[model samples]
Target: NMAIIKEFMRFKVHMEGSVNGHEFEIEGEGEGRPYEGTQTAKLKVTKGGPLPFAWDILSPQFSKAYVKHPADIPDYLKLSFPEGFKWERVMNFEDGGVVTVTQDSSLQDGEFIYKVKLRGTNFPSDGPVMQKKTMGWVASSERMYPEDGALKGESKQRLKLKDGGHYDAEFWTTYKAKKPVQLPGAYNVNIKLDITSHNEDYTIVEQYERAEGRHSTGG
Candidate 1:
């Protein structure tokens, strides 16, 4: 027998900008079954101008998986989805153009796990150069035994270059839900990246929120 796998109802995204600050807001609605699913997502990015570079939404499902440098998509999962499921060069930039996005998803024991990674690099003919990367993960589980609630998880890292020199740094973070909440709701995840190179110290902190939902039918 045939069954409807997944369905996406509505998606909305917004972006807010300031002279030195930027904000992104996203809202989505969707449902899925065993082998098929569909969801609508909106993304808005606001940056201080003159906008340094451009970006593209690589893969919606596997957000952290990309076909770019420093991070490459694995071969085994290449054909996991259809052509439209993957996007390349959706947006373009001028002289210093750079944008990267990747995502991954998995289902286990009445729960869904989603991971996303974003990285951006920009360098101009005559200006201060900058590089940044962000990583995050989210997990949602249905009502089960005593702990049949939702949980949130995430992580992030960042790096900056200066004076045409080499510098290296890293940041690590881990999280666990203290108590169970409702399912299919947005969970705000916080991330922090620290860097120390050549007697200089800097820190970058970012926040990401994820919303998800799931439904199951008897076999």
Candidate 2:
């Protein structure tokens, strides 16, 4: 009795590297069963509010599912976005002896190896440093300490921190796909996404426009 349960979920952000090599992965974590017609719901790992990667990287062009292109190569674009149009993020995990994070990808010959790894507890390879973390990412409609008092943007990313308790962290990046849409390597690469479903319109224009396109849309 989850109040009749029409749909209750929190876990769905799946996509794994490959376009020229062709290999993608996606899993929104929700599969308790219900509603059959394009579904995937499960990812409710939160704290202080609703958070998980809180992102905002746009170029806009999401219309490619799985992989299959080579009739001239053109309709599997690169970037596109216009949801709630809001922006910001907040997800900080702390629990010493069981901190594990990973994301190691690759795509051959030219190079494009994704990175983001963490284990045990002890990080510092000195590559993306400025040291001093504290960003209450916000923008997706605001609230969690609002009043125009949380618009973080003063920290480059790379990953390297140590506060105690068996934890490991690593963030490495590599990309190379300049012209000819080359392929064949890192096992064919694939990681594409365009997730939706976040109350009060959590993007895709907050869930398909609600009172005039959010704001600021001038190509």
Candidate 3:
């Protein structure tokens, strides 16, 4: 019996921005799982997902993960939450018409580890640019492990999968854009990791399956 296994891909965006009157800070999964697992898979042997219509900051379960930088929040948030929260990844910049966002991605357990960096067009008002490492994508045929699955430890997390077996590290970052990306108010900032697979080949899943017995990491 050929089991119709619609594969899935993961989409994660790490971003931070400031609008005219308010600040924008968000990072996490897009509306992908449902779209990927349910819709995309049905359309083609491979599953797909959304452009992150919803962000982690909005999700109650993941709010604490992004709601940071007490200084970044409006006075209302400070009053409501009391203690100020802040993110080391995000910084401040001038406010105006256009918006720009960039991203960097990392691996931590099962969740996509994220950090924010400032980026923009040639506009003079924009802050100086800061760069991060490049994206590291795993091939379908490669072996790998999720940070939390089968992996253990609290400090300096890392992973190594088959083909070569397991490797280690506290945490690992996967992607970083090369230049500042201009964005519209409607769009946010981030480097997304898309997970798309088909009956013929499910990349990420196949890697994990081969690396299941291996360890994982985060930092």
Candidate 4:
């Protein structure tokens, strides 16, 4: 029953564009499933967008499986430390500044095509890191809403370690519908992180979902 409810609530977000004469689409989905007789959220993202990226956001209810074996794990699992928790942006943005609403554990996966920026507490320089590395994704005031309290946009990223490895990380805003205190133009920005490895190589994949609806001030 839990699995059916989760799947029935499945939602998706897709974006399409072109770069260097190449066209692509980025897609992701969130569904519910039964694990140990409990309900869980399964999320996945594929490299369909104009860019090359993929990801899977595992439900927090299953955190124990990955936490037990940390060393042999992939990059995605490392980034999602602590537990799968939800968050909301409760404060207003500064003038000309953007507010960031972050989840306790977020993940991102994609091709290291461009050099992206890394923000937050434990980063070296804010400049670009090495290629083929996954890091945490952070959003700026320019990407979020102040008056309307909507998530204007989101960005994906990876963390490049000094040892030449990368971890999946991301930051964005989202809200829930079917709640009071409706904010005009509010939307749900869903992000998921998945782990993938082939030929002894590991990588993280990410997906972003944006939906039109009425959501609370925060989630």
What TM-score, computed on C-alpha atoms, does each candidate reach? 0.24, 0.21, 0.22, 0.29
Clashes per prediction? 10, 50, 25, 24
- Cα error, candidate 2, residue 63 (Å): 12
RMSD list, candidates in order: 16.5, 17.8, 18.5, 14.7
Which candidate ranks first by TM-score, i.e. highest?
4
**Which parts of model 2 have CA positions greater than 4 angstroms off?**
1-27, 30-43, 52-65, 71-102, 105-195, 200-219
Worst lDDT 10-window in candidate 3? 205-214
CA lDDT, every prediction?
0.25, 0.23, 0.23, 0.26
CA displacement after TM-score superposition, residue 132 of candidate 4 (Å): 2.3
> What's the residue-level lDDT of 202 in candidate 4?
22
TM-score ranking of the models? 4, 1, 3, 2
Q: Please give the lDDT score at residue 83 for candidate 4.
A: 24
lDDT per residue for candidate 4 within 95-139, as digits (tens), equals: 111222233222223110111111112122232221223333232
lDDT of each residue in 1-219, candidate 3, tens digit only: 011111232334444443332334444443222112121111111112221111111111121112112222221211212221222211122221122333343333433333454322232323121111111222211122223212111222212232343222222222112222211111111112223332222211111111111121211
